[PDB]
Design a protein around this ligand. Structure first.
Ligand SMILES: *[C@@H]1O[C@H](CO[C@@H]2O[C@@H](C)[C@@H](O)[C@@H](O)[C@@H]2O)[C@@H](O[C@@H]2O[C@H](CO)[C@@H](O)[C@H](O)[C@H]2NC(C)=O)[C@H](O)[C@H]1NC(C)=O
Ligand code: TZ2
Ligand code: TZ2
Ligand code: NAG
Ligand code: NAG
Ligand code: NAG
Ligand code: CL
Lengths: 536, 538
């Protein structure tokens, strides 16, 4: 006897989901729904094609394969790195999506939240424990969707102008999943007329690229960009740079000269051979730089995100944007000498100068000197704790905080309704050292509501805090406003404007309104540093 | 002699002098005013180094101030005390090389530490005869022997054709040096100790003090130094030989002296003094503020290298220095040449007026350097706020010309063995006639250090009188011991030495001493470390 709540018919055919247990009650989950033809063989590097219809009842009770990617080996056995590693088998046959809905299915159309994971466009999976949509579905009545999209060479290797490897195919995988939601989410009780995209890091940069790409704009109504932006120094490469990186990668794997022959030879290569050389194509020694990322193709991205955010009309848009307290701290242990998760990472002045060259790899000698002079505390210029913290701030400000301030400002000046935040709470369970503070991605578990599971050992304060964040995010998805039409005791979260520059602190204390998101420092990155590059 | 006050008759190397008994609030003082220390630098002697005054016959009357060195007079605000207190108060003349001595009455029984005052006025103005430089309070209250000299200013003191014999440059600094040599030889006759000489000066006077620290022949003439709101390093105190040559050549063309250095200088010597003064402001390379036409030149003689190079390589182990700044160094300079600024209104300016002001205030800045300044000083939370823009403009001028050259000097001196004490003076005189927005302008600490509030007729508050006494004590304890702290008063907060490690300085105001750290540390790293690199590369 089948559960009729677990039986759904979508355009491709019948699906069978699973009844999952959330702390407050059951939820319906439809996991591993195919949204595209497997992008394998001749389809490697090609745009996704819609999944052909299937016969019978497709089993949607388990997560599907993770898109082929590099697996972190930096610290084996360690939860801090391993919680981000694939938790299902790696395969190029990975274009599946997941749906969580209340149990029983909503009676009236419910706002939809679509999650786009991060992982520097080279990693990630919609199946990670921290992206579990059951708490939002059960507590807030949300319809949550998450898709896998191609990463690394598979999703972003490009030979711009070619038909066989046009670039941005991982973003086209995301778009195809958004199209799938428009066409099929009503069958799950979701409202296709109320779709909110939310993502973190490369997922937030992806959300921003859907805001900037006109064919995606009819597929969603609101957006959340957590610790990532389409503008900035890592999220995109020029066509010339993508071409150089693809050509070098092909040379490294013995390929093959026309694009057709090069791409055909790359298609014969085992997936692990491409992954084995993907990190060898970066132009300089660097951190917070990824080999295969979205390309300014003149197609998905008609111009650079910088040009599109300056000239765009965003009147019809509501956006929630923010950062964590220590955006850059993870990136330091990965490639800056003197940094380690196993010690306090107290560094010398020489190590700070060398770190700035790795952290700002495009910087000339004069630009790197300007960074060092701005971030040095001239009262304590040799203090190792100050230097360690300044190094973390350089990386986080350059890559995330100042591109976010730039984006928030441009969106607000061009008609968008913008809400901004800083997330400052460090999870009690965090296994990374205290010096790393709140690293990138450690807000996600709170927004998804993992502290609501009593077996995960978060504090009572953390459980109450997670409930407050779930409410801000779902109130934003429902209304374009994170404010509750009920709690007059907590201060209101004001929209971010170019005039007042208001943002809120998200921590265990009630919301606090602050003005100017690193205003002086971000004028250095956003206004001065470009001028120092343009004239040199 | 016979019927005169026997306490006022003194002999010096050049001959006999008769001084005057002056009244200070607490009692009498001896003053020997208008003592000639050089041959009048007139006629063929114009632009030439000073020659020592030849001996005179009879008793020279030293009872009144002598002539002020020929200079530009500010007539912008008729009757305004704010400008007029700095204007000449005696006849303008090229015959101006005289000095003044104040001592206790009767003269000290044992050798007393000497304080030598060098006035400021951008190397184009000033006089040792101004009321704010009155040595009688320090002589009476502290028992000090105070000396002040007139030195040539403008073209007369600083016009140079480097390499020429007739106009070698720095002759105004040589006038100061000749007065220091005069003190070494003659001050014992007044009860002064030639083995305990402290130089103190403000603004161009402080820059002059710094140049005596950096010029070896002056080093044997003093033991300690006070630099108030001025330094030898920085953007206004010196010019290169090439720049001095360009300015002198242009001035000569402007007065009808055309093209050989001998002929040019000989023609400049035939010109009336007022003709040179009338054209001296026309030779500046750009529209600017805090820039003076005729200043010390890096000649390879008085200054063997640039002050920047000499402060970086110098050994200052044997030296004790007191250095500091006022709260609003740049505010006066804005009313003089920045559009939108006035002493008669609040001077609330627009962003456009701030950018134009930065070009005038940092005249050497390229487009990129000027934008770095604007971006650093803008409050990005209120980028168009007129009060912040007005205050940022004042801070740009003050930091670039005084605060950051002072921090640079204090750091180099301390790292190279000197004992340094640093301060910020934050008290605005209750009597001040400049508007409140101008805060504490440059030079408005001088009247407190000289002890003018001790005179009940000047209308300072009781707190100001107590504050002046405290400052007079810091300055004279520094002159006596190389330490401004009183050893028999450990109850009062101590003034710690400035070091590269702790960067400690004190606030001088009506409240007891407060110790602060980092003299505008972040902002001065911008001016002292970044901006030179922005010039050196682009
Ligand atoms: C403050 O005054 C200045 C100077 O103006 C003069 O002095 C005034 C007190 C009054 O007597 C005026 O009639 C005088 O002209 C003003 O600065 C000028 O502003 C204009 C327009 O912005 C500009 O084109 C000029 O170059 C400026 N001139 C100078 C000498 O600065 C200023 O506008 C006044 N500010 C305020 C807030 O009223
Ligand atoms: N860039 N890349 N990062 C991959 C490393 N894995 C991590 C991810 C995130 N946060 C991390 C924090 C610490 C360590 C690894 C992390 C957030 C987005 C998902 C990927
Ligand atoms: N530079 N120059 N300034 C000449 C104008 N006179 C003034 C002086 C000083 N302070 C002033 C403050 C306000 C107005 C004129 C001033 C201190 C040094 C002596 C000269
Ligand atoms: C921290 O650990 C790394 C490990 O390679 C080491 O290089 C660094 O010197 C250590 N720092 C301290 C302060 O011990
Ligand atoms: C929670 O703590 C208990 C020990 O009290 C431990 O057995 C359990 O595994 C912890 N849970 C997690 C998710 O770490
Ligand atoms: C001092 O105050 C009196 C009024 O009590 C006034 O007439 C005089 O002009 C003032 N003098 C000074 C120097 O301010
Ligand atoms: Cl780069």
């Amino acid at each position: 006897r089948e559960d009729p709540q677990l039986l759904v018919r979508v355009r491709g055919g019948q699906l069978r989901g699973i009844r999952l247990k959330a702390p407050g009650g059951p939820v319906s989950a439809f996991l591993g729904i195919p949204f595209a033809e497997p992008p394998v063989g001749s389809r490697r590097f090609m745009p996704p094609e819609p999944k052909r219809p299937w016969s019978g009842v497709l089993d949607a009770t388990t997560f599907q394969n993770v898109c082929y990617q590099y697996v972190d080996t930096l610290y084996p056995g360690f939860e801090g790195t391993e919680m981000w590693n694939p938790n299902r088998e790696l395969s190029e046959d990975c274009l599946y999506l997941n749906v969580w809905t209340p149990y029983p299915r909503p009676a009236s159309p419910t706002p939809v939240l679509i999650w786009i994971y991060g992982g520097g466009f080279y990693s990630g999976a919609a199946s990670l424990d921290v992206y579990d949509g059951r708490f939002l579905a059960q507590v807030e009545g949300a319809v949550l969707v998450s898709m896998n999209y191609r990463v690394g060479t598979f999703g972003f290797l490009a030979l711009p102008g070619s038909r066989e490897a046009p670039g941005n195919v991982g973003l086209l995988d995301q778009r195809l999943a958004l199209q799938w939601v428009q066409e099929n989410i009503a069958a799950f009780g979701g409202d296709p007329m109320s779709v909110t995209l939310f993502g973190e890091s490369a997922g937030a940069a992806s959300v921003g690229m859907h805001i900037l790409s006109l064919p995606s704009r009819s597929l969603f109504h609101r957006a959340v960009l957590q610790s990532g932006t389409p503008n900035g120094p890592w999220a995109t490469v020029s066509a010339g740079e993508a071409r150089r990186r693809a050509t070098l990668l092909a040379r490294l794997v013995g390929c093959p000269g026309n694009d057709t022959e090069l791409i055909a030879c790359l298609r014969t290569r085992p997936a692990q051979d491409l992954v084995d050389h993907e990190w060898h194509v970066l132009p300089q020694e660097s951190i917070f730089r990824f080999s295969f990322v979205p390309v300014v193709d003149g197609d998905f991205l008609s111009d650079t995100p910088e040009a599109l955010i300056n000239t765009g009309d965003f009147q019809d848009l509501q956006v929630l944007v923010g950062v964590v307290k220590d955006e850059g701290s993870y990136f330091l242990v990965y490639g800056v000498p003197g940094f380690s998760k196993d010690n306090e990472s107290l560094i010398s002045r020489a190590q700070f100068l060398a770190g700035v060259r790795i952290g700002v790899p495009q910087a000339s000698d004069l630009a790197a000197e300007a960074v060092v002079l701005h971030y040095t505390d001239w009262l304590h210029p040799e203090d190792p704790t100050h230097l360690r913290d300044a190094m973390s701030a350089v990386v986080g400000d350059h890559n995330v905080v100042c591109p976010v301030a730039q984006l928030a400002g441009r969106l607000a000046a061009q008609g968008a309704r913008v809400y901004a935040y800083i997330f400052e709470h460090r999870a009690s369970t965090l296994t990374w050292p205290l010096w790393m503070g709140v690293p990138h991605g450690y807000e996600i578990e709170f927004i998804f509501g993992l502290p609501l599971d009593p077996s995960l050992n978060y504090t009572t304060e953390e459980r109450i805090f997670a409930q407050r964040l779930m409410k801000y995010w779902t109130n934003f998805a429902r209304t374009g406003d994170p404010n509750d039409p009920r709690d007059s005791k907590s201060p209101q979260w004001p929209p971010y404007t170019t005039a007042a520059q208001q943002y809120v602190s998200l921590n265990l204390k009630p919301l606090e309104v602050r003005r100017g998101l690193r205003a002086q420092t971000c004028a250095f990155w956003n206004r001065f540093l470009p001028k120092l590059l343009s004239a040199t």
